[PDB]
Structure 1
């Protein structure tokens, strides 16, 4: 529960193979970084890069292959030892330098032309890694230098989760299967599956989205003052109108990040929307205590704030205020599962 304990647990996760397997098997993520880096070949060719949180080294290697002269691959967990071997295996150890330890205390021999980092957690800010990237930017990035990605956006949409609907309806189906009526279990199932205060990470599709998604916050990484916004809360108000009739279960929150277009003048966007190909981040679901019926053109509005949890700064908290239709204003406070 102390910082040293919390740090050891966080980096211990990244010392193990499973999380790296997940990240690198995520083709949408990994290919987006590869292409985003290549899009910026003109600005990277012959230049220096800092990879904040290099992991197994893969993004740093992408940067070298794109023509970077020198890459500092900084990694705080024990996985740096594996990165060292990956870099050597690819013939890159003379110019990709795997550096152990936190980026906050690394000492590079020079400021750098570019920073690359994959720092995003569930609901964007779970893990709270962004502070480390901003620290590195302030301390090591040259004036006018390149950030990859350069920005993040947060989106919300109201949802009718088809999988949840099935799980709640299960109990009224038992009679047909086994000859025992359990339809009375539905209220209890609803309390268990919806009445908790955890953020649920689950993949949705367009079939679950009840209104046009809306951006409710923007994080431009070059902006001074972003560090202090993180502490006070990131988010904003939203308002949308429903497509059609459905049981409203709550809200899905997701994000995108954008890589500069470079020479092409066409930015590359990595999205975790339910309307786009699936990623390991899925979406972050905020369930209401029970389903609320809605109809075509029902207004839903609210305010969403992403904060660090008081107990654990790396654990995402979300404060939700919302109003459905003519119902009273309600609030719910969530923490990451």
Structure 2
């Protein structure tokens, strides 16, 4: 409710702006289309729950690209009223049923064989729609049923971010020949203490090979596991450069309904086609130069905000060519836009 900021959250999803962004994201939307196509024969006579269907696009993929026994399209925002009309104008109202309900207070006619949802936020967990997905899974997913995505993982890499640091911090040293360096302290707090959403990381700015640090198993994960997620990492710097911070993204995996089948992946990283999530940048307070062979090791922690339940803080701990504790640095980034 108020702790979930549901008025603002679902109010935003009642306008076309966010849905235009999702549907204009071709890698994202086509991935879900490909999952339905790759599993078309296996979906026949299955009951599908599309949790948070928005405009209903995923439900329409299920009803038009396969032959399920039924599709339950669930959407809590005011968009559901239009989704019902869209389903009917695409000739699917006999298979797709629209429920204008929250997953938490959901009443469905039957349990389901497949629960498909697009719940991933920035750095995977932001806004914690995953909680709603897990609650609907526990109540409505039949034993042996399929979660789509079936697993997800958080991936990070040490990176260079020259343009960001120069434009936001070093800029103040001599703009037009004026000494504005007195503002650099304020610039570090205002521009570097928060994550930068919609960062486009270039491959040449990666200082090492990216590593998966946290992996979520969508069948076994529980709501209580989401309060604090942690992963260790150790990076060998592969090219000499400037360590400005960490870039974070995620992947989502869609297991085939049949063991012998194709598994489909949605990757939001720098080596894949850009998505509306792009990547997320976490700047250090001060950059440090590094050379090939340097070891950057530590951990990342995603700590859910105890009061504002759609928010979290991301804490990096890292050490460069060292194991001691007096050398360890840490920075905590509140995840707010």
TM-score greater than 0.5 by the shorter chain: yes
Instruction: State the Cα RMSD in Å.
Output: 2.1
Q: What is the distance in 2 between the residues matched to 1:317 and 1:230? A: 12
User: Retained in 2: the 8 A contact 1:190–1:290?
Assistant: no
Deviations 1:266-285 (A, max 9, x none): 21110011121111111222
Give runs of aligned pairs for residues 142-221 of structure 1, distance below 5 A.
142-167=142-167, 168=169, 170=171, 174=175, 180=177, 182=179, 184=181, 187-188=184-185, 191-192=188-189, 195-196=192-193, 198-201=194-197, 202-221=199-218
Matched, 1:17 2:16: yes
Query: 1:151-172: CA deviations, max 9, x gaps?
Result: 1011111010143144255557
Distance 1:2 1:189, change over 3 A: closer
Superposition pairs for residues 60-209 of structure 1, below 5 Å? 60-65=59-64, 66-167=66-167, 168=169, 170=171, 174=175, 180=177, 182=179, 184=181, 187-188=184-185, 191-192=188-189, 195-196=192-193, 198-201=194-197, 202-209=199-206
2:273 aligned with 1:277: yes
Secondary structure, aligned partner of 2:131: helix
Distance change (3 Å), C-alpha of 1:71 and 1:325: same
With over 3 angstroms needed to count, the CA separation of the structure-2 counterparts of 1:292 and 1:193, relative to structure 1, is farther
Matched, 1:39 2:38: yes
Matched residue, 2:250: 255
Q: Which moved more, 1:255-264 or 1:117-126?
A: 255-264
Q: Assess if the C-alpha contact under 8 Å between 1:255 and 1:273 holds in 2.
A: yes
Unaligned runs of 5+ in 2: none
Look up the SS of the partner of 2:145 in the other structure: strand
Kept in 2, the 8 Å contact 1:162–1:208? The answer is no
Q: CA deviation at 1:3?
A: 3.3
Aligned counterparts of 2:162 and 2:87: Cα–Cα separation in 1: 44
- Residues 1:307 and 1:188: Cα distance change in structure 2 (over 3 Å): closer
Q: 2:318 corresponds to which residue?
A: 322
Deviation at 1:173, TM superposition (A): 7.8
Distance 1:210 1:290 in 2: 16
1:3 match: secondary structure: coil
Q: Which runs of 4+ in 1 moved over 6 A?
A: none
Shift of 1:265: 2.3
3-state DSSP of counterpart to 1:104: helix
TM-score normalised by the chain length of structure 1: 0.91
Please say if residues 54 and 73 of structure 1, whose CA atoms lie closer than 8 Å, have aligned partners that are also in contact.
yes
| Residues 281-309 of structure 1: per-residue CA shift (max 9 Å, x gap) | 11222211111111111110111111221
- Distance in 2 (CA, whole Å) between partners of 1:189 and 1:335 is 17
User: For residues 209 and 236 of structure 1, do their structure 2 counterparts lie closer, same or farther at Cα, with a shift above 3 Å needed?
Assistant: same
Unmatched 5+ stretches in structure 1: none
Q: C-alpha displacement at 1:261, in angstroms?
A: 3.1
Q: Which residue of 1 aligns with 2:235?
A: 240
Task: Name the CA distance, whole Å, in 1 between partners of 2:225 and 2:174.
Answer: 48
Q: How far apart are the structure 1 equivalents of 2:170 and 2:204? A: 18
* Aligned positions, number: 329
> How far apart in 1 are the matches of 2:257 and 2:318?
40
